[PDB]
Protein backbone atom coordinates (compact mmCIF):
# COMPACT_ATOMS: atom_id res chain seq x y z
CA UNK A 44 0.00 0.00 0.00
CA UNK A 45 2.68 2.54 1.03
CA UNK A 46 4.67 1.90 -2.18
CA UNK A 47 4.12 4.12 -5.24
CA UNK A 48 5.23 3.82 -8.86
CA UNK A 49 4.04 4.11 -12.46
CA UNK A 50 0.91 2.05 -12.96
CA UNK A 51 1.06 2.11 -16.79
CA UNK A 52 4.33 2.06 -18.78
CA UNK A 53 4.62 1.77 -22.57
CA UNK A 54 7.68 1.39 -24.83
CA UNK A 55 9.00 0.10 -28.10
CA UNK A 56 11.12 -2.95 -28.92
CA UNK A 57 14.69 -1.72 -28.66
CA UNK A 58 14.18 1.34 -26.44
CA UNK A 59 14.91 1.45 -22.74
CA UNK A 60 12.92 2.42 -19.67
CA UNK A 61 13.34 3.83 -16.18
CA UNK A 62 10.74 2.85 -13.57
CA UNK A 63 10.77 4.93 -10.40
CA UNK A 64 9.31 3.60 -7.18
CA UNK A 65 8.75 5.68 -4.04
CA UNK A 66 8.73 4.30 -0.52
CA UNK A 67 8.48 5.68 3.05
CA UNK A 68 12.11 6.55 3.89
CA UNK A 69 11.98 4.84 7.35
CA UNK A 70 15.23 3.75 8.94
CA UNK A 71 14.41 0.13 8.07
CA UNK A 72 13.38 0.95 4.52
CA UNK A 73 16.60 2.74 3.69
CA UNK A 74 18.62 -0.37 2.88
CA UNK A 75 15.90 -3.01 3.12
CA UNK A 76 15.69 -5.32 0.11
CA UNK A 77 14.41 -3.52 -2.98
CA UNK A 78 12.96 -5.87 -5.61
CA UNK A 79 11.68 -5.83 -9.12
CA UNK A 80 9.73 -8.93 -9.96
CA UNK A 81 7.42 -10.31 -12.64
CA UNK A 82 3.91 -11.60 -11.90
CA UNK A 83 3.30 -15.24 -12.62
CA UNK A 84 0.78 -18.02 -12.02
CA UNK A 85 -1.02 -18.41 -8.69
CA UNK A 86 0.00 -15.02 -7.28
CA UNK A 87 3.68 -15.74 -7.70
CA UNK A 88 6.09 -12.93 -8.40
CA UNK A 89 9.55 -13.87 -9.68
CA UNK A 90 12.48 -11.68 -8.76
CA UNK A 91 14.12 -10.17 -11.82
CA UNK A 92 16.42 -7.84 -9.97
CA UNK A 93 17.10 -6.92 -6.32
CA UNK A 94 19.25 -4.59 -4.26
CA UNK A 95 21.05 -7.59 -2.76
CA UNK A 96 23.00 -8.31 -5.94
CA UNK A 97 20.59 -10.73 -7.64
CA UNK A 98 20.15 -10.19 -11.35
CA UNK A 99 18.14 -12.64 -13.46
CA UNK A 100 20.04 -13.97 -16.50
CA UNK A 101 17.18 -12.46 -18.48
CA UNK A 102 18.36 -9.04 -17.24
CA UNK A 103 22.12 -9.75 -17.40
CA UNK A 104 23.83 -6.73 -18.98
CA UNK A 105 20.45 -5.26 -19.68
CA UNK A 106 19.22 -3.70 -16.45
CA UNK A 107 20.24 -2.09 -13.16
CA UNK A 108 18.61 -1.03 -9.90
CA UNK A 109 19.75 2.17 -8.11
CA UNK A 110 18.56 3.11 -4.63
CA UNK A 111 18.04 6.72 -3.44
CA UNK A 112 17.40 6.55 0.36
CA UNK A 113 17.41 10.35 0.71
CA UNK A 114 14.63 10.84 -1.88
CA UNK A 115 12.86 7.72 -0.60
CA UNK A 116 12.95 6.19 -4.05
CA UNK A 117 14.62 3.60 -6.20
CA UNK A 118 14.94 3.30 -9.92
CA UNK A 119 14.83 0.26 -12.11
CA UNK A 120 16.43 0.70 -15.54
CA UNK A 121 15.74 -1.78 -18.31
CA UNK A 122 17.18 -1.66 -21.82
CA UNK A 123 16.97 -3.63 -25.05
CA UNK A 124 13.31 -4.19 -24.39
CA UNK A 125 11.58 -7.00 -26.23
CA UNK A 126 7.88 -7.86 -26.54
CA UNK A 127 8.78 -10.65 -24.19
CA UNK A 128 9.08 -7.93 -21.57
CA UNK A 129 5.40 -7.03 -21.87
CA UNK A 130 3.82 -8.06 -18.61
CA UNK A 131 2.78 -7.21 -15.11
CA UNK A 132 5.45 -6.41 -12.51
CA UNK A 133 5.79 -5.48 -8.87
CA UNK A 134 8.33 -3.11 -7.41
CA UNK A 135 8.70 -3.45 -3.69
CA UNK A 136 10.42 -3.67 -0.35
CA UNK A 137 11.29 -6.78 1.61
CA UNK A 138 10.37 -10.14 0.10
CA UNK A 139 8.21 -10.49 -3.00
CA UNK A 140 5.68 -12.68 -1.22
CA UNK A 141 5.00 -10.14 1.55
CA UNK A 142 2.80 -7.10 1.05
CA UNK A 143 5.01 -4.07 0.51
CA UNK A 144 4.87 -3.45 -3.21
CA UNK A 145 3.39 -1.51 -6.08
CA UNK A 146 1.81 -3.00 -9.18
CA UNK A 147 3.31 -1.91 -12.52
CA UNK A 148 2.14 -2.59 -16.06
CA UNK A 149 4.75 -2.75 -18.80
CA UNK A 150 3.84 -2.98 -22.49
CA UNK A 151 6.40 -3.20 -25.36
CA UNK A 152 5.21 -2.66 -28.99
CA UNK A 153 7.07 -3.66 -32.23
CA UNK A 154 7.23 -0.12 -33.57
CA UNK A 155 5.24 2.91 -32.43
CA UNK A 156 0.73 2.55 -28.71
CA UNK A 157 -1.98 4.39 -26.76
CA UNK A 158 -2.97 3.97 -23.14
CA UNK A 159 -2.29 0.27 -22.63
CA UNK A 160 -2.70 -1.88 -19.56
CA UNK A 161 -1.56 -5.47 -19.19
CA UNK A 162 -3.70 -8.06 -17.42
CA UNK A 163 -2.17 -11.27 -16.19
CA UNK A 164 -4.56 -13.93 -15.02
CA UNK A 165 -4.54 -17.69 -14.40
CA UNK A 166 -6.36 -20.19 -16.59
CA UNK A 167 -10.00 -20.64 -15.66
CA UNK A 168 -10.18 -17.35 -13.77
CA UNK A 169 -11.88 -14.01 -14.27
CA UNK A 170 -10.63 -10.72 -15.66
CA UNK A 171 -12.18 -7.27 -15.41
CA UNK A 172 -11.21 -4.89 -18.18
CA UNK A 173 -11.98 -1.30 -17.33
CA UNK A 174 -12.83 0.86 -20.34
CA UNK A 175 -12.72 4.62 -19.72
CA UNK A 176 -14.48 7.24 -21.89
CA UNK A 177 -15.23 10.98 -21.93
CA UNK A 178 -18.60 12.58 -21.21
CA UNK A 179 -19.26 13.28 -24.89
CA UNK A 180 -19.28 9.51 -25.49
CA UNK A 181 -20.99 8.44 -22.27
CA UNK A 182 -24.27 7.47 -24.03
CA UNK A 183 -22.83 6.09 -27.27
CA UNK A 184 -22.12 2.42 -28.02
CA UNK A 185 -19.71 0.61 -25.70
CA UNK A 186 -17.58 -2.13 -27.34
CA UNK A 187 -14.77 -4.61 -26.81
CA UNK A 188 -12.74 -5.90 -29.76
CA UNK A 189 -10.03 -8.56 -30.06
CA UNK A 190 -7.30 -8.46 -32.72
CA UNK A 191 -7.91 -11.71 -34.52
CA UNK A 192 -5.81 -12.03 -37.66
CA UNK A 193 -4.83 -8.35 -37.63
CA UNK A 194 -8.55 -7.67 -37.78
CA UNK A 195 -10.50 -6.21 -34.87
CA UNK A 196 -13.31 -8.64 -34.10
CA UNK A 197 -16.25 -7.67 -31.91
CA UNK A 198 -16.37 -9.56 -28.64
CA UNK A 199 -19.23 -7.70 -26.93
CA UNK A 200 -21.47 -4.67 -27.66
CA UNK A 201 -23.83 -2.51 -25.64
CA UNK A 202 -26.25 -3.30 -28.52
CA UNK A 203 -26.45 -6.94 -27.38
CA UNK A 204 -24.00 -8.75 -29.72
CA UNK A 205 -21.87 -11.30 -27.98
CA UNK A 206 -19.20 -13.18 -29.90
CA UNK A 207 -20.02 -16.96 -30.05
CA UNK A 208 -16.78 -18.01 -28.31
CA UNK A 209 -17.63 -15.89 -25.24
CA UNK A 210 -21.39 -16.38 -24.69
CA UNK A 211 -22.34 -17.19 -21.08
CA UNK A 212 -19.02 -16.05 -19.61
CA UNK A 213 -18.87 -12.39 -20.49
CA UNK A 214 -20.77 -9.34 -19.29
CA UNK A 215 -20.55 -5.67 -19.96
CA UNK A 216 -20.94 -3.87 -16.60
CA UNK A 217 -22.11 -0.26 -16.82
CA UNK A 218 -20.99 1.66 -13.71
CA UNK A 219 -23.52 3.58 -11.65
CA UNK A 220 -23.14 7.09 -10.22
CA UNK A 221 -22.11 8.56 -13.59
CA UNK A 222 -18.53 7.28 -13.44
CA UNK A 223 -16.87 7.58 -16.82
CA UNK A 224 -15.99 3.98 -17.59
CA UNK A 225 -17.58 0.63 -18.25
CA UNK A 226 -16.17 -2.76 -17.43
CA UNK A 227 -16.04 -6.04 -19.27
CA UNK A 228 -15.92 -9.07 -17.07
CA UNK A 229 -14.75 -12.33 -18.64
CA UNK A 230 -14.99 -15.68 -16.83
CA UNK A 231 -13.37 -19.08 -17.25
CA UNK A 232 -10.42 -17.67 -19.18
CA UNK A 233 -8.95 -19.91 -21.84
CA UNK A 234 -5.43 -19.87 -23.24
CA UNK A 235 -7.01 -18.90 -26.52
CA UNK A 236 -8.45 -15.75 -24.89
CA UNK A 237 -5.02 -14.18 -24.62
CA UNK A 238 -4.21 -11.32 -26.94
CA UNK A 239 -4.77 -7.72 -27.85
CA UNK A 240 -8.14 -6.19 -26.92
CA UNK A 241 -9.59 -2.81 -27.77
CA UNK A 242 -12.00 -0.96 -25.49
CA UNK A 243 -14.13 1.54 -27.29
CA UNK A 244 -16.70 4.14 -26.37
CA UNK A 245 -18.57 5.79 -29.20
CA UNK A 246 -18.18 5.12 -32.91
CA UNK A 247 -17.15 8.60 -34.05
CA UNK A 248 -13.79 10.09 -34.92
CA UNK A 249 -14.53 11.39 -31.42
CA UNK A 250 -14.21 7.78 -30.16
CA UNK A 251 -12.54 6.83 -26.82
CA UNK A 252 -10.14 3.88 -27.03
CA UNK A 253 -8.01 1.81 -24.72
CA UNK A 254 -5.67 -1.08 -25.46
CA UNK A 255 -5.62 -4.13 -23.21
CA UNK A 256 -3.00 -6.89 -23.42
CA UNK A 257 -4.51 -10.01 -21.92
CA UNK A 258 -2.18 -12.76 -20.74
CA UNK A 259 -3.54 -16.09 -19.49
CA UNK A 260 -1.12 -18.32 -17.63
CA UNK A 261 -0.70 -22.06 -17.31
CA UNK A 262 0.28 -23.22 -13.81
CA UNK A 263 3.83 -24.26 -12.78
CA UNK A 264 4.11 -27.95 -11.88
CA UNK A 265 5.00 -28.69 -8.29
CA UNK A 266 7.71 -31.41 -8.22
CA UNK A 267 7.06 -34.50 -6.15
CA UNK A 268 9.44 -37.28 -5.32
CA UNK A 269 8.12 -40.63 -4.13
CA UNK A 270 9.30 -44.23 -3.84
CA UNK A 271 7.88 -47.23 -5.69
CA UNK A 272 4.92 -48.77 -3.79
CA UNK A 273 4.88 -45.76 -1.49
CA UNK A 274 2.06 -43.22 -1.51
CA UNK A 275 1.47 -39.62 -2.59
CA UNK A 276 -0.96 -36.93 -1.53
CA UNK A 277 -2.03 -34.16 -3.89
CA UNK A 278 -3.48 -31.14 -2.07
CA UNK A 279 -5.78 -29.52 -4.62
CA UNK A 280 -6.36 -25.89 -3.68
CA UNK A 281 -8.48 -24.11 -6.25
CA UNK A 282 -10.64 -21.23 -5.07
CA UNK A 283 -13.49 -21.12 -2.63
CA UNK A 284 -14.88 -19.44 -5.70
CA UNK A 285 -15.16 -22.85 -7.41
CA UNK A 286 -15.94 -24.95 -4.33
CA UNK A 287 -19.21 -25.99 -5.99
CA UNK A 288 -17.82 -26.95 -9.38
CA UNK A 289 -17.03 -30.63 -9.93
CA UNK A 290 -13.38 -31.46 -9.40
CA UNK A 291 -11.06 -33.85 -11.22
CA UNK A 292 -7.62 -35.38 -10.86
CA UNK A 293 -6.21 -36.44 -14.21
CA UNK A 294 -2.95 -37.58 -15.81
CA UNK A 295 -1.49 -35.84 -18.84
CA UNK A 296 -0.75 -37.87 -21.94
CA UNK A 297 1.62 -37.74 -24.87
CA UNK A 298 -1.50 -36.39 -26.55
CA UNK A 299 -3.47 -33.31 -25.53
CA UNK A 300 -5.79 -35.62 -23.61
CA UNK A 301 -5.78 -35.60 -19.82
CA UNK A 302 -7.38 -38.83 -18.61
CA UNK A 303 -9.27 -38.69 -15.28
CA UNK A 304 -7.84 -40.64 -12.36
CA UNK A 305 -10.65 -39.42 -10.05
CA UNK A 306 -13.87 -37.41 -10.07
CA UNK A 307 -16.59 -36.00 -7.91
CA UNK A 308 -19.04 -37.52 -10.50
CA UNK A 309 -18.04 -41.15 -9.88
CA UNK A 310 -15.15 -41.78 -12.29
CA UNK A 311 -12.27 -43.78 -10.89
CA UNK A 312 -9.77 -45.07 -13.46
CA UNK A 313 -9.19 -48.90 -13.46
CA UNK A 314 -5.41 -48.55 -13.03
CA UNK A 315 -6.10 -47.02 -9.62
CA UNK A 316 -8.79 -49.42 -8.38
CA UNK A 317 -8.22 -50.20 -4.72
CA UNK A 318 -5.47 -47.61 -4.17
CA UNK A 319 -7.01 -44.15 -4.80
CA UNK A 320 -8.70 -41.97 -2.19
CA UNK A 321 -10.62 -38.77 -2.86
CA UNK A 322 -10.89 -36.89 0.45
CA UNK A 323 -13.67 -34.40 1.21
CA UNK A 324 -13.38 -30.70 0.44
CA UNK A 325 -12.61 -27.75 2.82
CA UNK A 326 -14.69 -24.70 3.55
CA UNK A 327 -11.87 -23.20 1.46
CA UNK A 328 -12.96 -25.50 -1.36
CA UNK A 329 -9.58 -27.24 -1.15
CA UNK A 330 -9.34 -31.04 -1.09
CA UNK A 331 -6.72 -33.80 -1.26
CA UNK A 332 -6.23 -37.05 -3.20
CA UNK A 333 -4.21 -39.99 -1.92
CA UNK A 334 -2.59 -42.62 -4.09
CA UNK A 335 -1.00 -45.71 -2.61
CA UNK A 336 1.10 -48.54 -4.00
CA UNK A 337 2.83 -46.46 -6.64
CA UNK A 338 3.87 -48.07 -9.88
CA UNK A 339 6.70 -46.70 -12.05
CA UNK A 340 4.05 -46.18 -14.72
CA UNK A 341 2.24 -43.80 -12.27
CA UNK A 342 4.88 -41.10 -12.72
CA UNK A 343 4.06 -38.12 -14.90
CA UNK A 344 2.21 -34.82 -15.08
CA UNK A 345 -0.94 -34.59 -13.00
CA UNK A 346 -3.52 -31.85 -13.10
CA UNK A 347 -6.24 -31.26 -10.61
CA UNK A 348 -8.97 -28.99 -11.89
CA UNK A 349 -12.54 -27.71 -11.75
CA UNK A 350 -15.10 -28.13 -14.48
CA UNK A 351 -18.84 -28.91 -14.37
CA UNK A 352 -18.55 -32.23 -16.20
CA UNK A 353 -15.62 -33.58 -14.17
CA UNK A 354 -13.31 -33.49 -17.20
CA UNK A 355 -10.49 -31.19 -18.25
CA UNK A 356 -11.72 -28.59 -20.71
CA UNK A 357 -10.69 -25.22 -22.03
CA UNK A 358 -11.22 -22.40 -19.56
CA UNK A 359 -10.97 -24.75 -16.63
CA UNK A 360 -8.90 -23.69 -13.59
CA UNK A 361 -6.10 -26.11 -12.82
CA UNK A 362 -3.13 -26.99 -10.67
CA UNK A 363 -0.14 -29.17 -11.68
CA UNK A 364 2.33 -31.67 -10.26
CA UNK A 365 5.20 -33.67 -11.72
CA UNK A 366 5.52 -37.03 -9.98
CA UNK A 367 8.66 -39.16 -9.77
CA UNK A 368 8.55 -42.79 -8.67
CA UNK A 369 12.01 -44.12 -7.78
CA UNK A 370 13.48 -47.50 -6.75
CA UNK A 371 14.55 -48.01 -3.15
CA UNK A 372 18.31 -48.37 -3.54
CA UNK A 373 20.09 -50.73 -1.16
CA UNK A 374 22.54 -45.46 2.54
CA UNK A 375 22.46 -42.91 5.37
CA UNK A 376 22.50 -39.09 5.00
CA UNK A 377 25.94 -37.48 5.24
CA UNK A 378 25.94 -35.07 8.20
CA UNK A 379 27.41 -31.58 8.39
CA UNK A 380 27.67 -29.47 11.54
CA UNK A 381 27.83 -25.68 11.56
CA UNK A 382 27.39 -22.95 14.18
CA UNK A 383 25.20 -19.85 14.23
CA UNK A 384 26.63 -16.81 12.45
CA UNK A 385 29.11 -19.02 10.56
CA UNK A 386 28.90 -21.31 7.54
CA UNK A 387 29.12 -24.71 5.87
CA UNK A 388 30.80 -25.84 2.70
CA UNK A 389 28.89 -28.93 1.57
CA UNK A 390 30.38 -31.20 -1.05
CA UNK A 391 27.88 -32.55 -3.55
CA UNK A 392 28.97 -35.52 -5.66
CA UNK A 393 27.59 -35.99 -9.15
CA UNK A 394 28.36 -38.53 -11.82
CA UNK A 395 31.43 -37.36 -13.80
CA UNK A 396 29.64 -37.91 -17.12
CA UNK A 397 26.80 -35.60 -16.02
CA UNK A 398 29.42 -32.84 -15.72
CA UNK A 399 27.76 -30.05 -17.73
CA UNK A 400 24.32 -30.98 -16.42
CA UNK A 401 22.58 -28.56 -14.03
CA UNK A 402 23.29 -28.99 -10.32
CA UNK A 403 20.69 -28.21 -7.65
CA UNK A 404 20.69 -27.70 -3.91
CA UNK A 405 17.29 -28.00 -2.27
CA UNK A 406 15.56 -28.42 1.07
CA UNK A 407 14.04 -31.91 1.37
CA UNK A 408 10.82 -32.19 3.40
CA UNK A 409 10.15 -35.93 3.95
CA UNK A 410 8.50 -38.65 1.85
CA UNK A 411 4.83 -37.71 2.54
CA UNK A 412 5.37 -34.06 1.70
CA UNK A 413 7.17 -35.33 -1.41
CA UNK A 414 8.52 -31.89 -2.27
CA UNK A 415 12.08 -30.61 -2.34
CA UNK A 416 11.72 -26.83 -2.94
CA UNK A 417 14.82 -25.32 -4.55
CA UNK A 418 17.15 -22.88 -2.85
CA UNK A 419 19.86 -22.51 -5.50
CA UNK A 420 21.08 -23.99 -8.78
CA UNK A 421 24.10 -23.74 -11.09
CA UNK A 422 22.40 -21.34 -13.52
CA UNK A 423 22.19 -18.21 -11.39
CA UNK A 424 18.97 -18.85 -9.56
CA UNK A 425 18.61 -18.28 -5.84
CA UNK A 426 15.52 -18.26 -3.66
CA UNK A 427 14.90 -14.67 -2.54
CA UNK A 428 15.37 -15.41 1.17
CA UNK A 429 18.91 -16.63 0.40
CA UNK A 430 20.35 -13.71 -1.50
CA UNK A 431 23.81 -12.89 -0.11
CA UNK A 432 24.21 -16.08 1.89
CA UNK A 433 24.11 -18.97 -0.59
CA UNK A 434 26.14 -20.06 -3.61
CA UNK A 435 26.76 -23.14 -5.71
CA UNK A 436 30.28 -23.49 -7.08
CA UNK A 437 31.51 -25.88 -9.77
CA UNK A 438 34.66 -26.40 -7.72
CA UNK A 439 36.33 -28.67 -6.88
CA UNK A 440 34.85 -30.17 -10.05
CA UNK A 441 35.29 -33.55 -11.76
CA UNK A 442 32.41 -35.27 -9.99
CA UNK A 443 31.91 -32.81 -7.16
CA UNK A 444 30.52 -29.31 -6.73
CA UNK A 445 30.34 -27.11 -3.60
CA UNK A 446 27.43 -25.47 -1.82
CA UNK A 447 28.36 -22.57 0.43
CA UNK A 448 25.73 -21.43 2.92
CA UNK A 449 26.61 -18.81 5.55
CA UNK A 450 24.96 -16.45 8.05
CA UNK A 451 23.72 -19.60 9.79
CA UNK A 452 20.99 -19.92 12.42
CA UNK A 453 19.08 -22.79 14.09
CA UNK A 454 16.40 -22.49 11.40
CA UNK A 455 18.77 -23.92 8.77
CA UNK A 456 18.85 -27.24 10.60
CA UNK A 457 17.37 -29.91 8.34
CA UNK A 458 17.65 -32.24 5.34
CA UNK A 459 18.91 -31.17 1.95
CA UNK A 460 19.41 -32.76 -1.42
CA UNK A 461 22.22 -32.43 -3.85
CA UNK A 462 20.61 -32.95 -7.30
CA UNK A 463 21.77 -33.16 -10.90
CA UNK A 464 20.29 -34.56 -14.12
CA UNK A 465 20.75 -38.01 -5.52
CA UNK A 466 22.62 -37.08 -2.33
CA UNK A 467 21.00 -36.34 1.03
CA UNK A 468 22.76 -34.08 3.55
CA UNK A 469 21.67 -33.34 7.11
CA UNK A 470 22.70 -30.00 8.50
CA UNK A 471 22.99 -29.70 12.24
CA UNK A 472 23.57 -26.52 14.24
CA UNK A 473 25.76 -27.04 17.29
CA UNK A 474 27.01 -24.78 20.03
CA UNK A 475 30.08 -22.96 18.84
CA UNK A 476 31.28 -19.75 17.25
CA UNK A 477 32.59 -18.58 13.87
CA UNK A 478 36.32 -18.84 13.33
CA UNK A 479 36.23 -15.91 10.89
CA UNK A 480 35.43 -12.53 12.41
CA UNK A 481 33.72 -9.67 10.61
CA UNK A 482 31.76 -6.50 11.45
CA UNK A 483 27.94 -6.70 11.35
CA UNK A 484 26.35 -3.41 10.24
CA UNK A 485 28.91 -1.75 7.95
CA UNK A 486 28.27 1.62 6.25
CA UNK A 487 30.48 3.23 3.60
CA UNK A 488 29.94 6.80 2.37
CA UNK A 489 29.70 7.95 -1.25
CA UNK A 490 32.92 8.93 -3.01
CA UNK A 491 34.92 8.15 0.14
CA UNK A 492 37.22 5.14 0.54
CA UNK A 493 36.24 2.35 2.91
CA UNK A 494 38.22 -0.54 4.26
CA UNK A 495 36.76 -3.58 6.02
CA UNK A 496 38.59 -6.01 8.29
CA UNK A 497 38.43 -9.77 8.42
CA UNK A 498 40.28 -11.75 11.13
CA UNK A 499 41.67 -15.23 10.46
CA UNK A 500 42.81 -17.52 13.30
CA UNK A 501 46.01 -19.55 13.21
CA UNK A 502 43.96 -22.50 12.00
CA UNK A 503 43.77 -20.74 8.60
CA UNK A 504 47.30 -19.35 8.21
CA UNK A 505 48.36 -21.72 5.47
CA UNK A 506 44.93 -21.38 3.81
CA UNK A 507 44.31 -18.93 0.99
CA UNK A 508 42.21 -15.95 2.03
CA UNK A 509 39.80 -13.97 -0.13
CA UNK A 510 37.34 -11.13 -0.20
CA UNK A 511 34.56 -11.04 -2.81
CA UNK A 512 31.28 -9.38 -3.71
CA UNK A 513 28.29 -11.65 -3.86
CA UNK A 514 26.02 -11.75 -6.91
CA UNK A 515 23.81 -14.69 -7.97
CA UNK A 516 26.15 -15.98 -10.72
CA UNK A 517 29.13 -16.09 -8.42
CA UNK A 518 31.05 -14.39 -5.69
CA UNK A 519 33.59 -12.07 -7.47
CA UNK A 520 37.02 -11.66 -5.83
CA UNK A 521 38.39 -8.21 -4.96
CA UNK A 522 41.65 -6.38 -4.21
CA UNK A 523 42.23 -7.09 -0.54
CA UNK A 524 45.33 -6.07 1.42
CA UNK A 525 47.07 -8.54 3.64
CA UNK A 526 47.83 -6.74 6.90
CA UNK A 527 49.57 -7.69 10.14
CA UNK A 528 48.51 -10.53 12.47
CA UNK A 529 45.51 -10.15 14.76
CA UNK A 530 44.75 -10.57 18.45
CA UNK A 531 41.18 -11.74 18.39
CA UNK A 532 41.94 -15.41 19.14
CA UNK A 533 43.09 -17.75 21.93
CA UNK A 534 46.19 -19.97 21.56
CA UNK A 535 46.97 -17.66 18.65
CA UNK A 536 49.16 -14.63 18.10
CA UNK A 537 51.79 -14.88 15.37
CA UNK A 538 50.06 -17.30 13.01
CA UNK A 539 46.73 -15.50 12.93
CA UNK A 540 45.96 -12.78 10.45
CA UNK A 541 43.92 -9.75 9.41
CA UNK A 542 42.99 -9.25 5.76
CA UNK A 543 41.33 -6.08 4.69
CA UNK A 544 38.97 -5.35 1.84
CA UNK A 545 39.53 -1.89 0.45
CA UNK A 546 36.96 0.04 -1.61
CA UNK A 547 38.92 2.99 -3.01
CA UNK A 548 36.10 5.13 -4.47
CA UNK A 549 32.70 4.04 -3.27
CA UNK A 550 29.89 4.30 -5.85
CA UNK A 551 26.16 3.60 -5.18
CA UNK A 552 26.66 0.29 -6.98
CA UNK A 553 29.25 -0.77 -4.35
CA UNK A 554 26.42 -1.51 -1.96
CA UNK A 555 25.49 -5.10 -1.24
CA UNK A 556 27.03 -8.30 0.12
CA UNK A 557 30.72 -8.88 0.65
CA UNK A 558 32.15 -12.20 1.78
CA UNK A 559 35.36 -12.83 3.54
CA UNK A 560 36.39 -16.46 3.06
CA UNK A 561 39.02 -19.17 3.14
CA UNK A 562 40.29 -21.67 0.61
CA UNK A 563 42.74 -24.51 -0.04
CA UNK A 564 43.31 -24.76 -3.77
CA UNK A 565 39.96 -25.68 -5.31
CA UNK A 566 38.44 -26.82 -2.00
CA UNK A 567 36.54 -23.99 -0.34
CA UNK A 568 35.84 -23.51 3.35
CA UNK A 569 34.46 -21.13 5.89
CA UNK A 570 33.05 -17.75 4.91
CA UNK A 571 31.78 -14.68 6.72
CA UNK A 572 29.43 -12.16 5.24
CA UNK A 573 28.98 -8.45 5.72
CA UNK A 574 26.57 -6.05 4.09
CA UNK A 575 28.07 -2.79 2.89
CA UNK A 576 25.55 0.09 2.92
CA UNK A 577 25.96 3.47 1.18
CA UNK A 578 24.86 7.00 2.24
CA UNK A 579 26.30 10.37 1.21
CA UNK A 580 26.48 13.10 3.90
CA UNK A 581 28.75 11.82 6.65
CA UNK A 582 28.59 10.37 10.16
Ligand SMILES: *[C@@H]1O[C@H](CO[C@@H]2O[C@@H](C)[C@@H](O)[C@@H](O)[C@@H]2O)[C@@H](O)[C@H](O)[C@H]1NC(C)=O
Pocket residue numbers: 111114116
Ligand atom coordinates in the same frame (compact mmCIF):
# COMPACT_ATOMS: atom_id res chain seq x y z
C1 LIG B 1 16.73 11.65 -6.67
O1 LIG B 1 18.12 11.87 -6.51
C2 LIG B 1 18.91 11.45 -7.64
C3 LIG B 1 20.36 11.66 -7.26
O2 LIG B 1 20.50 12.66 -6.26
C4 LIG B 1 20.57 13.56 -5.08
O3 LIG B 1 19.54 14.53 -4.94
C5 LIG B 1 19.43 15.53 -6.01
C6 LIG B 1 18.30 16.48 -5.62
C7 LIG B 1 20.78 16.23 -6.26
O4 LIG B 1 21.12 17.02 -5.13
C8 LIG B 1 21.87 15.17 -6.51
O5 LIG B 1 23.11 15.84 -6.70
C9 LIG B 1 21.94 14.22 -5.30
O6 LIG B 1 22.98 13.26 -5.42
C10 LIG B 1 18.51 12.23 -8.88
O7 LIG B 1 19.26 11.77 -10.01
C11 LIG B 1 17.01 12.06 -9.13
O8 LIG B 1 16.63 12.86 -10.24
C12 LIG B 1 16.22 12.44 -7.88
N1 LIG B 1 14.80 12.25 -8.09
C13 LIG B 1 13.89 12.31 -7.11
C14 LIG B 1 12.46 12.09 -7.51
O9 LIG B 1 14.19 12.53 -5.94
Ligand SMILES: *[C@@H]1O[C@H](CO)[C@@H](O)[C@H](O)[C@H]1NC(C)=O
Pocket residue numbers: 104105106107109120122552
Ligand atom coordinates in the same frame (compact mmCIF):
# COMPACT_ATOMS: atom_id res chain seq x y z
C1 LIG C 1 22.12 1.09 -16.42
O1 LIG C 1 22.36 0.31 -17.62
C2 LIG C 1 23.05 1.03 -18.65
C3 LIG C 1 23.11 0.12 -19.85
O2 LIG C 1 21.82 -0.04 -20.42
C4 LIG C 1 24.43 1.45 -18.14
O3 LIG C 1 25.13 2.16 -19.16
C5 LIG C 1 24.26 2.32 -16.90
O4 LIG C 1 25.53 2.70 -16.38
C6 LIG C 1 23.45 1.58 -15.83
N1 LIG C 1 23.23 2.41 -14.67
C7 LIG C 1 24.15 2.60 -13.71
C8 LIG C 1 23.74 3.49 -12.58
O5 LIG C 1 25.25 2.06 -13.76
Ligand SMILES: *[C@@H]1O[C@H](CO)[C@@H](O)[C@H](O)[C@H]1NC(C)=O
Pocket residue numbers: 189191208235236
Ligand atom coordinates in the same frame (compact mmCIF):
# COMPACT_ATOMS: atom_id res chain seq x y z
C1 LIG D 1 -12.94 -19.20 -30.85
O1 LIG D 1 -12.48 -17.79 -30.85
C2 LIG D 1 -11.13 -17.61 -31.31
C3 LIG D 1 -10.77 -16.15 -31.07
O2 LIG D 1 -10.74 -15.82 -29.69
C4 LIG D 1 -11.06 -18.04 -32.77
O3 LIG D 1 -9.78 -17.77 -33.33
C5 LIG D 1 -11.36 -19.54 -32.82
O4 LIG D 1 -11.25 -20.04 -34.15
C6 LIG D 1 -12.77 -19.80 -32.28
N1 LIG D 1 -13.03 -21.24 -32.25
C7 LIG D 1 -14.23 -21.78 -32.47
C8 LIG D 1 -14.31 -23.27 -32.39
O5 LIG D 1 -15.21 -21.09 -32.74
Ligand SMILES: *[C@@H]1O[C@H](CO)[C@@H](O)[C@H](O)[C@H]1NC(C)=O
Pocket residue numbers: 512514516517518519
Ligand atom coordinates in the same frame (compact mmCIF):
# COMPACT_ATOMS: atom_id res chain seq x y z
C1 LIG E 1 28.83 -11.06 -11.19
O1 LIG E 1 29.93 -11.97 -11.42
C2 LIG E 1 30.37 -11.97 -12.78
C3 LIG E 1 31.39 -13.08 -12.91
O2 LIG E 1 30.77 -14.35 -13.02
C4 LIG E 1 30.92 -10.59 -13.13
O3 LIG E 1 31.34 -10.58 -14.50
C5 LIG E 1 29.85 -9.53 -12.91
O4 LIG E 1 30.40 -8.24 -13.11
C6 LIG E 1 29.29 -9.63 -11.49
N1 LIG E 1 28.19 -8.68 -11.31
C7 LIG E 1 28.34 -7.50 -10.68
C8 LIG E 1 27.10 -6.66 -10.59
O5 LIG E 1 29.41 -7.14 -10.21
